Protein backbone atom coordinates (compact mmCIF):
# COMPACT_ATOMS: atom_id res chain seq x y z
CA UNK A 1 0.00 0.00 0.00
CA UNK A 2 1.52 3.26 1.59
CA UNK A 3 3.79 3.82 4.04
CA UNK A 4 3.61 6.68 6.20
CA UNK A 5 7.38 7.63 4.88
CA UNK A 6 5.68 7.55 1.12
CA UNK A 7 1.97 10.07 2.36
CA UNK A 8 4.27 12.17 3.68
CA UNK A 9 6.61 12.99 0.33
CA UNK A 10 3.05 12.61 -1.68
CA UNK A 11 1.80 15.40 0.01
CA UNK A 12 5.27 17.53 0.70
CA UNK A 13 5.41 17.10 -3.26
CA UNK A 14 1.89 18.52 -4.36
CA UNK A 15 2.08 21.23 -2.34
CA UNK A 16 5.22 22.46 -4.05
CA UNK A 17 2.71 23.55 -6.88
CA UNK A 18 1.13 25.93 -3.97
CA UNK A 19 3.85 27.73 -2.98
CA UNK A 20 3.76 29.97 -6.41
CA UNK A 21 0.67 31.18 -4.29
CA UNK A 22 0.64 30.48 -0.72
CA UNK A 23 5.07 30.58 -0.81
CA UNK A 24 6.90 28.36 1.53
CA UNK A 25 4.04 27.94 4.32
CA UNK A 26 2.20 25.12 6.40
CA UNK A 27 -0.91 26.82 4.22
CA UNK A 28 0.60 25.46 0.52
CA UNK A 29 1.20 22.21 2.91
CA UNK A 30 -2.05 22.50 3.60
CA UNK A 31 -3.72 22.85 0.01
CA UNK A 32 -1.31 20.28 -1.17
CA UNK A 33 -3.03 17.29 0.97
CA UNK A 34 -6.03 18.55 0.25
CA UNK A 35 -5.60 18.88 -3.58
CA UNK A 36 -4.92 15.32 -3.32
CA UNK A 37 -7.84 13.87 -1.48
CA UNK A 38 -7.03 14.70 2.29
CA UNK A 39 -9.31 16.76 4.87
CA UNK A 40 -8.00 20.04 5.82
CA UNK A 41 -8.03 18.15 9.70
CA UNK A 42 -6.00 15.26 7.95
CA UNK A 43 -3.60 18.10 6.38
CA UNK A 44 -2.04 18.80 9.95
CA UNK A 45 1.57 16.65 10.44
CA UNK A 46 3.94 19.27 8.99
CA UNK A 47 5.36 22.56 11.35
CA UNK A 48 3.70 26.23 10.36
CA UNK A 49 6.90 27.11 9.47
CA UNK A 50 7.21 25.21 6.10
CA UNK A 51 10.61 24.50 6.92
CA UNK A 52 10.22 20.52 5.94
CA UNK A 53 8.83 21.56 2.95
CA UNK A 54 11.77 23.64 2.05
CA UNK A 55 14.20 20.84 3.10
CA UNK A 56 12.20 19.05 1.08
CA UNK A 57 12.48 20.45 -2.01
CA UNK A 58 16.11 21.18 -1.58
CA UNK A 59 16.75 17.44 -1.46
CA UNK A 60 14.67 16.73 -4.71
CA UNK A 61 16.86 19.02 -6.01
CA UNK A 62 19.77 17.36 -5.12
CA UNK A 63 18.50 14.39 -6.12
CA UNK A 64 17.63 15.46 -9.68
CA UNK A 65 21.29 16.93 -10.09
CA UNK A 66 23.02 13.48 -8.94
CA UNK A 67 21.00 11.75 -11.62
CA UNK A 68 22.12 14.54 -14.43
CA UNK A 69 25.89 14.27 -13.00
CA UNK A 70 25.51 10.73 -13.25
CA UNK A 71 24.01 10.34 -16.62
CA UNK A 72 26.80 13.22 -18.37
CA UNK A 73 29.48 11.10 -16.54
CA UNK A 74 28.06 7.99 -18.13
CA UNK A 75 28.64 9.64 -21.58
CA UNK A 76 32.36 9.97 -21.11
CA UNK A 77 32.59 6.18 -19.88
CA UNK A 78 30.69 5.72 -23.07
CA UNK A 79 33.40 7.83 -25.24
CA UNK A 80 29.97 9.08 -26.50
CA UNK A 81 31.20 12.67 -25.10
CA UNK A 82 34.25 14.99 -24.25
CA UNK A 83 35.15 15.10 -20.06
CA UNK A 84 35.01 18.82 -19.71
CA UNK A 85 38.04 20.85 -17.69
CA UNK A 86 37.01 21.33 -13.97
CA UNK A 87 36.15 24.61 -13.91
CA UNK A 88 33.91 24.37 -16.87
CA UNK A 89 32.57 21.19 -15.32
CA UNK A 90 31.72 23.16 -11.69
CA UNK A 91 30.04 26.45 -13.81
CA UNK A 92 27.69 23.77 -15.76
CA UNK A 93 26.84 21.63 -12.27
CA UNK A 94 26.21 25.01 -10.54
CA UNK A 95 24.16 27.13 -12.96
CA UNK A 96 21.95 23.35 -13.42
CA UNK A 97 21.48 23.31 -9.87
CA UNK A 98 20.40 26.93 -9.39
CA UNK A 99 18.13 26.75 -12.34
CA UNK A 100 15.95 24.39 -10.64
CA UNK A 101 15.07 27.92 -8.10
CA UNK A 102 13.26 29.86 -10.84
CA UNK A 103 10.03 28.21 -10.86
CA UNK A 104 10.23 29.09 -7.48
CA UNK A 105 12.47 31.99 -7.25
CA UNK A 106 9.88 34.61 -6.24
CA UNK A 107 9.64 33.16 -2.67
CA UNK A 108 13.05 31.36 -2.21
CA UNK A 109 14.77 34.91 -0.78
CA UNK A 110 12.29 34.05 2.26
CA UNK A 111 13.11 29.82 2.15
CA UNK A 112 16.74 31.01 2.37
CA UNK A 113 16.43 33.07 5.63
CA UNK A 114 14.59 29.68 7.16
CA UNK A 115 17.09 27.62 5.86
CA UNK A 116 19.44 30.04 8.02
CA UNK A 117 17.56 29.45 11.31
CA UNK A 118 19.27 27.26 13.85
CA UNK A 119 17.51 24.85 13.97
CA UNK A 120 17.25 23.92 10.46
CA UNK A 121 21.12 24.79 9.86
CA UNK A 122 22.49 21.53 10.92
CA UNK A 123 19.94 20.04 8.26
CA UNK A 124 20.92 22.67 5.47
CA UNK A 125 23.88 22.54 5.71
CA UNK A 126 24.40 18.90 5.62
CA UNK A 127 22.02 19.18 2.14
CA UNK A 128 24.61 21.81 0.94
CA UNK A 129 28.02 19.81 1.54
CA UNK A 130 26.26 16.42 0.41
CA UNK A 131 25.66 18.52 -2.96
CA UNK A 132 29.01 20.04 -3.11
CA UNK A 133 30.73 16.46 -2.66
CA UNK A 134 28.88 15.06 -5.61
CA UNK A 135 29.61 18.01 -7.75
CA UNK A 136 32.91 17.76 -6.64
CA UNK A 137 33.12 13.85 -7.14
CA UNK A 138 31.82 14.02 -11.00
CA UNK A 139 34.35 16.86 -11.80
CA UNK A 140 37.38 14.66 -11.29
CA UNK A 141 41.34 15.62 -9.95
CA UNK A 142 43.29 22.02 -2.67
CA UNK A 143 42.27 19.22 -0.08
CA UNK A 144 38.92 18.05 0.83
CA UNK A 145 37.87 20.93 3.03
CA UNK A 146 39.17 23.92 1.24
CA UNK A 147 36.99 22.13 -2.06
CA UNK A 148 34.39 22.08 0.00
CA UNK A 149 34.15 25.30 1.33
CA UNK A 150 35.45 26.74 -1.92
CA UNK A 151 32.54 25.91 -4.43
CA UNK A 152 29.53 26.07 -1.04
CA UNK A 153 30.95 29.58 -1.32
CA UNK A 154 30.54 29.87 -4.79
CA UNK A 155 27.24 28.16 -4.74
CA UNK A 156 25.63 30.57 -1.87
CA UNK A 157 26.94 33.37 -3.22
CA UNK A 158 26.29 33.41 -6.68
CA UNK A 159 22.40 32.12 -4.57
CA UNK A 160 21.88 35.25 -3.08
CA UNK A 161 23.46 37.55 -6.58
CA UNK A 162 20.88 35.18 -8.36
CA UNK A 163 17.95 36.76 -6.09
CA UNK A 164 18.16 40.49 -7.11
CA UNK A 165 19.21 39.09 -11.01
CA UNK A 166 16.92 40.64 -13.56
CA UNK A 167 19.35 40.59 -16.71
CA UNK A 168 17.63 38.14 -19.56
CA UNK A 169 17.87 34.39 -18.62
CA UNK A 170 20.35 35.71 -15.67
CA UNK A 171 22.69 36.55 -17.90
CA UNK A 172 24.80 38.59 -14.66
CA UNK A 173 24.03 35.28 -12.49
CA UNK A 174 26.33 33.28 -14.74
CA UNK A 175 28.79 35.70 -15.02
CA UNK A 176 29.35 36.55 -11.67
CA UNK A 177 29.55 32.12 -10.99
CA UNK A 178 32.30 32.50 -14.00
CA UNK A 179 34.06 35.08 -12.04
CA UNK A 180 33.72 33.27 -8.74
CA UNK A 181 34.61 29.68 -10.24
CA UNK A 182 38.19 31.32 -11.78
CA UNK A 183 38.64 33.05 -8.61
CA UNK A 184 39.08 29.26 -6.80
CA UNK A 185 41.01 28.18 -9.64
CA UNK A 186 43.44 31.05 -9.47
CA UNK A 187 43.62 31.66 -5.65
CA UNK A 188 43.02 35.22 -6.14
CA UNK A 189 30.68 41.36 -9.12
CA UNK A 190 31.90 42.27 -5.52
CA UNK A 191 29.30 44.97 -5.28
CA UNK A 192 26.73 42.66 -6.85
CA UNK A 193 27.27 40.05 -3.57
CA UNK A 194 27.06 43.24 -1.70
CA UNK A 195 23.13 43.80 -3.20
CA UNK A 196 23.17 40.42 -2.39
CA UNK A 197 24.00 40.29 1.37
CA UNK A 198 21.56 43.50 1.79
CA UNK A 199 18.62 41.43 0.55
CA UNK A 200 19.45 38.81 2.38
CA UNK A 201 19.79 41.06 5.31
CA UNK A 202 16.58 42.57 4.54
CA UNK A 203 14.67 39.03 4.66
CA UNK A 204 15.92 38.09 7.73
CA UNK A 205 15.33 41.03 9.42
CA UNK A 206 11.54 40.39 8.05
CA UNK A 207 10.78 37.82 10.83
CA UNK B 1 61.02 41.25 11.22
CA UNK B 2 59.38 42.23 8.00
CA UNK B 3 56.10 40.43 9.62
CA UNK B 4 55.87 43.10 12.59
CA UNK B 5 55.91 46.41 10.64
CA UNK B 6 53.19 44.86 8.06
CA UNK B 7 50.93 44.12 11.28
CA UNK B 8 51.89 47.59 12.38
CA UNK B 9 50.81 49.02 9.22
CA UNK B 10 47.51 46.96 9.12
CA UNK B 11 47.04 48.29 12.63
CA UNK B 12 47.51 51.49 11.60
CA UNK B 13 45.41 51.66 8.88
CA UNK B 14 42.40 50.51 11.12
CA UNK B 15 42.30 54.06 12.05
CA UNK B 16 41.48 55.52 8.59
CA UNK B 17 39.25 52.46 7.30
CA UNK B 18 36.34 54.58 8.70
CA UNK B 19 37.28 57.29 6.20
CA UNK B 20 38.85 55.25 3.55
CA UNK B 21 37.09 51.36 3.33
CA UNK B 22 39.08 48.64 3.65
CA UNK B 23 41.45 49.80 0.87
CA UNK B 24 44.86 50.83 -0.14
CA UNK B 25 44.12 53.89 0.79
CA UNK B 26 43.40 53.20 4.67
CA UNK B 27 46.69 50.94 4.07
CA UNK B 28 48.75 54.00 2.59
CA UNK B 29 47.02 56.92 5.12
CA UNK B 30 48.53 53.83 8.33
CA UNK B 31 51.75 53.79 6.60
CA UNK B 32 51.72 57.92 6.40
CA UNK B 33 50.96 57.81 10.12
CA UNK B 34 54.14 56.01 11.17
CA UNK B 35 56.17 58.33 9.20
CA UNK B 36 56.46 55.79 6.04
CA UNK B 37 55.92 56.42 2.30
CA UNK B 38 52.24 55.72 0.93
CA UNK B 39 54.15 53.81 -1.02
CA UNK B 40 54.82 50.96 1.66
CA UNK B 41 51.43 50.07 1.07
CA UNK B 42 52.76 48.37 -2.38
CA UNK B 43 53.93 46.01 0.17
CA UNK B 44 50.44 44.71 0.35
CA UNK B 45 47.35 43.82 -1.72
CA UNK B 46 44.75 46.33 -3.63
CA UNK B 47 42.15 43.77 -2.54
CA UNK B 48 41.65 45.18 1.24
CA UNK B 49 41.30 41.37 2.27
CA UNK B 50 44.58 41.56 4.41
CA UNK B 51 43.33 44.52 6.34
CA UNK B 52 39.89 42.72 6.99
CA UNK B 53 41.20 39.22 7.92
CA UNK B 54 43.83 41.65 9.96
CA UNK B 55 40.83 42.88 11.72
CA UNK B 56 38.74 39.91 12.46
CA UNK B 57 41.87 37.81 13.96
CA UNK B 58 42.07 41.16 16.53
CA UNK B 59 38.10 40.77 17.37
CA UNK B 60 38.79 37.30 18.08
CA UNK B 61 41.87 37.94 20.09
CA UNK B 62 40.42 40.34 22.48
CA UNK B 63 36.92 38.52 22.61
CA UNK B 64 38.67 35.37 24.05
CA UNK B 65 40.35 38.06 26.27
CA UNK B 66 37.37 39.33 27.04
CA UNK B 67 35.30 35.61 27.96
CA UNK B 68 39.05 34.95 30.18
CA UNK B 69 38.19 38.06 31.99
CA UNK B 70 34.49 37.04 32.77
CA UNK B 71 35.39 33.17 33.68
CA UNK B 72 37.96 34.75 36.36
CA UNK B 73 35.22 37.16 37.60
CA UNK B 74 32.83 33.48 38.24
CA UNK B 75 36.05 31.91 39.51
CA UNK B 76 36.53 35.18 42.19
CA UNK B 77 33.10 34.69 43.16
CA UNK B 78 32.36 38.15 42.02
CA UNK B 79 29.88 36.78 39.69
CA UNK B 80 27.91 34.08 38.81
CA UNK B 81 28.01 31.91 36.60
CA UNK B 82 25.06 32.43 33.77
CA UNK B 83 23.45 30.06 31.38
CA UNK B 84 24.25 29.02 28.00
CA UNK B 85 21.18 31.14 26.44
CA UNK B 86 22.77 34.08 28.69
CA UNK B 87 26.33 33.60 27.83
CA UNK B 88 25.90 33.04 24.45
CA UNK B 89 23.40 36.17 24.27
CA UNK B 90 26.49 38.14 25.61
CA UNK B 91 29.49 36.59 23.80
CA UNK B 92 28.02 37.43 20.76
CA UNK B 93 26.86 40.92 21.20
CA UNK B 94 30.36 41.44 22.84
CA UNK B 95 31.68 40.47 19.07
CA UNK B 96 29.34 42.02 16.97
CA UNK B 97 30.05 45.73 18.92
CA UNK B 98 33.38 45.63 17.83
CA UNK B 99 31.54 46.59 14.22
CA UNK B 100 29.97 49.49 15.16
CA UNK B 101 32.71 51.64 14.41
CA UNK B 102 33.35 50.49 10.74
CA UNK B 103 29.88 49.83 10.27
CA UNK B 104 29.45 51.53 7.32
CA UNK B 105 32.24 49.38 5.61
CA UNK B 106 30.77 46.24 6.72
CA UNK B 107 28.78 44.90 4.11
CA UNK B 108 31.83 45.23 1.67
CA UNK B 109 34.21 43.88 4.05
CA UNK B 110 31.75 40.58 4.07
CA UNK B 111 31.39 40.31 0.24
CA UNK B 112 35.16 40.15 0.62
CA UNK B 113 35.18 37.84 3.38
CA UNK B 114 33.14 35.36 1.44
CA UNK B 115 35.25 35.09 -2.08
CA UNK B 116 36.90 31.89 -2.87
CA UNK B 117 40.10 32.51 -2.30
CA UNK B 118 39.31 34.21 1.60
CA UNK B 119 36.89 31.69 2.55
CA UNK B 120 39.48 29.33 3.97
CA UNK B 121 41.04 31.64 6.27
CA UNK B 122 37.41 33.50 6.98
CA UNK B 123 35.90 30.19 8.05
CA UNK B 124 39.06 29.14 9.66
CA UNK B 125 38.81 32.35 11.65
CA UNK B 126 35.07 31.93 12.15
CA UNK B 127 35.32 28.11 13.35
CA UNK B 128 37.89 29.28 16.02
CA UNK B 129 35.52 31.80 17.60
CA UNK B 130 32.82 29.71 17.78
CA UNK B 131 34.57 26.80 19.15
CA UNK B 132 35.96 29.46 21.69
CA UNK B 133 32.42 30.75 23.08
CA UNK B 134 31.50 27.32 23.58
CA UNK B 135 34.73 27.00 25.31
CA UNK B 136 33.59 29.31 27.83
CA UNK B 137 30.38 28.99 27.64
CA UNK B 138 30.72 25.28 29.27
CA UNK B 139 30.01 22.48 26.70
CA UNK B 140 28.91 21.26 29.91
CA UNK B 141 25.66 22.84 29.50
CA UNK B 142 24.26 21.45 26.55
CA UNK B 143 22.98 17.97 24.43
CA UNK B 144 24.41 19.01 21.34
CA UNK B 145 27.17 17.54 19.81
CA UNK B 146 30.54 19.36 18.49
CA UNK B 147 28.90 19.51 14.71
CA UNK B 148 25.29 20.83 15.98
CA UNK B 149 27.07 23.80 18.74
CA UNK B 150 29.19 24.38 15.55
CA UNK B 151 26.65 25.30 12.86
CA UNK B 152 24.10 26.93 14.96
CA UNK B 153 26.80 29.48 16.48
CA UNK B 154 28.03 30.20 13.39
CA UNK B 155 24.31 30.76 11.72
CA UNK B 156 23.79 32.60 15.11
CA UNK B 157 26.19 34.87 14.53
CA UNK B 158 26.17 35.53 10.56
CA UNK B 159 22.16 36.04 10.34
CA UNK B 160 22.83 38.76 14.00
CA UNK B 161 25.66 40.74 12.03
CA UNK B 162 23.30 40.46 8.64
CA UNK B 163 20.53 41.95 10.35
CA UNK B 164 22.73 44.53 11.90
CA UNK B 165 23.63 45.97 8.83
CA UNK B 166 19.65 47.02 8.23
CA UNK B 167 19.66 48.37 11.53
CA UNK B 168 18.67 51.79 12.41
CA UNK B 169 17.28 51.31 15.95
CA UNK B 170 18.83 52.89 19.14
CA UNK B 171 21.97 51.02 20.22
CA UNK B 172 20.67 48.10 17.64
CA UNK B 173 18.40 47.10 20.14
CA UNK B 174 16.37 45.36 17.06
CA UNK B 175 19.34 43.26 16.61
CA UNK B 176 19.80 41.88 20.22
CA UNK B 177 16.25 41.15 19.93
CA UNK B 178 16.80 38.95 17.06
CA UNK B 179 19.72 37.42 18.39
CA UNK B 180 17.56 36.49 21.79
CA UNK B 181 15.27 35.41 19.48
CA UNK B 182 17.27 32.83 17.54
CA UNK B 183 19.18 31.97 20.77
CA UNK B 184 16.20 30.70 21.77
CA UNK B 185 15.57 28.84 18.71
CA UNK B 186 19.09 26.65 19.16
CA UNK B 187 17.85 26.34 22.41
CA UNK B 188 14.33 24.61 21.59
CA UNK B 189 15.22 22.55 19.08
C1 LIG C 1 28.91 30.54 2.69
C2 LIG C 1 28.72 29.26 3.00
C3 LIG C 1 29.70 28.54 3.54
C4 LIG C 1 29.54 27.26 3.87
C5 LIG C 1 30.69 26.49 4.49
C6 LIG C 1 30.52 24.99 4.27
C7 LIG C 1 31.76 24.22 4.68
C8 LIG C 1 31.63 23.15 5.46
C9 LIG C 1 32.79 22.34 5.90
O1 LIG C 1 33.87 22.40 5.32
O2 LIG C 1 32.67 21.42 7.03
C10 LIG C 1 31.40 21.26 7.65
C11 LIG C 1 31.57 20.45 8.93
C12 LIG C 1 30.78 19.15 8.78
O3 LIG C 1 31.68 18.08 8.51
P1 LIG C 1 31.16 16.56 8.41
O4 LIG C 1 31.47 16.19 6.98
O5 LIG C 1 31.98 15.81 9.44
O6 LIG C 1 29.69 16.62 8.74
O7 LIG C 1 31.06 21.18 10.04
C13 LIG C 1 32.01 22.16 10.56
O8 LIG C 1 32.95 21.79 11.24
C14 LIG C 1 31.81 23.63 10.27
C15 LIG C 1 30.48 24.10 10.85
C16 LIG C 1 29.70 24.84 9.78
C17 LIG C 1 29.99 26.33 9.75
C18 LIG C 1 29.12 26.98 8.67
C19 LIG C 1 29.14 28.50 8.74
C20 LIG C 1 28.01 29.08 7.89
C21 LIG C 1 26.78 29.51 8.69
C22 LIG C 1 25.88 30.34 7.78
C23 LIG C 1 24.52 30.65 8.40
Redesign the interface.
Known amino acids: YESEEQLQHRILTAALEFVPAHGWTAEAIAEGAQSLGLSSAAASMFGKDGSELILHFVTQCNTRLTRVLEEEQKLVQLGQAEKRKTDQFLRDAVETRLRMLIPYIEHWPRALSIL????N??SS?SLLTSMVDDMWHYAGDFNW??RR??LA??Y??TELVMMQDSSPDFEDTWRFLEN??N??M???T?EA??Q???G???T??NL
Open positions: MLPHIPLYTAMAINTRVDANMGGLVGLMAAVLK
